[PDB]
Amino acid sequence: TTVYLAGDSTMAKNGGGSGTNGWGEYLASYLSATVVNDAVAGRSARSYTREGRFENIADVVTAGDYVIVEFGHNDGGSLSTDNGRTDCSGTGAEVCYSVYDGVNETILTFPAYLENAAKLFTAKGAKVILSSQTPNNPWETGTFVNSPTRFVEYAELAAEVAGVEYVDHWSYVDSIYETLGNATVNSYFPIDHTHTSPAGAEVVAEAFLKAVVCTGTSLKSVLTTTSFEGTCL
Numbered sequence: 001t002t003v004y005l006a007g008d009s010t011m012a013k014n015g016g017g018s019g020t021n022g023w024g025e026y027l028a029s030y031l032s033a034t035v036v037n038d039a040v041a042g043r044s045a046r047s048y049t050r051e052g053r054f055e056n057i058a059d060v061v062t063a064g065d066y067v068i069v070e071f072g073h074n075d076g077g078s079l080s081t082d083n084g085r086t087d088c089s090g091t092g093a094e095v096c097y098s099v100y101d102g103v104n105e106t107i108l109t110f111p112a113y114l115e116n117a118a119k120l121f122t123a124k125g126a127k128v129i130l131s132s133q134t135p136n137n138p139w140e141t142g143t144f145v146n147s148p149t150r151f152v153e154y155a156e157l158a159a160e161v162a163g164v165e166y167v168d169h170w171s172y173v174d175s176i177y178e179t180l181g182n183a184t185v186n187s188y189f190p191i192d193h194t195h196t197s198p199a200g201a202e203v204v205a206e207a208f209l210k211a212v213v214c215t216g217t218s219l220k221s222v223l224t225t226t227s228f229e230g231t232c233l
Ligand SMILES: *[C@@H]1O[C@H](CO)[C@@H](O)[C@H](O)[C@H]1NC(C)=O
Pocket: 097, 098, 099, 104, 105
């Protein structure tokens, strides 16, 4: 069995560079399946879709395989000065137009991008798991602040609509981030408040596996152990 990872710099190998790393790099050792980390730094649901990265996964995925999709960090911004990643506002069939890189592009909503990808993978017999984005350093201000982005809910909404599984990666990460405290968590974010140090990337990975176990996600079948930190919910 093979597990494919689609995400951004918080999941990708080498994370955001400069000694940071993505959480996808710490799954292999707890799974009895091959893990392919196709996350790329700086990608949004739109950017990733347009670059044909979802297709590359669809071409190679075989029945029974797993696909984990997690975006959000790069999905915001303004289309006035299109950065190529910003999705169209809304949660449904909304459609935005914008000239990016010399092409009048048809831009969809965040849920729409995830839903289309989910359907594409389901069609190939693969098991799809949409995951909410990881949180930016909540202990950045010296005090713990829990303020999810709109993309956390949008991911849950996309899963329902597409009829696939959802894992609240956000909540499980923030949960232990709160337990770990100011000093510890802040060391996970050397450079900025998004890109985690290798030590932090591991914790974020553990958080995901804790969510899988607690919610009963199908991926638990290939878990080599169920002894992870924190408590359920
Ligand atoms: C892009 O296409 C839409 C609909 O086809 C059109 O209304 C819009 O004006 C186009 N954008 C530009 C900059 O031409």
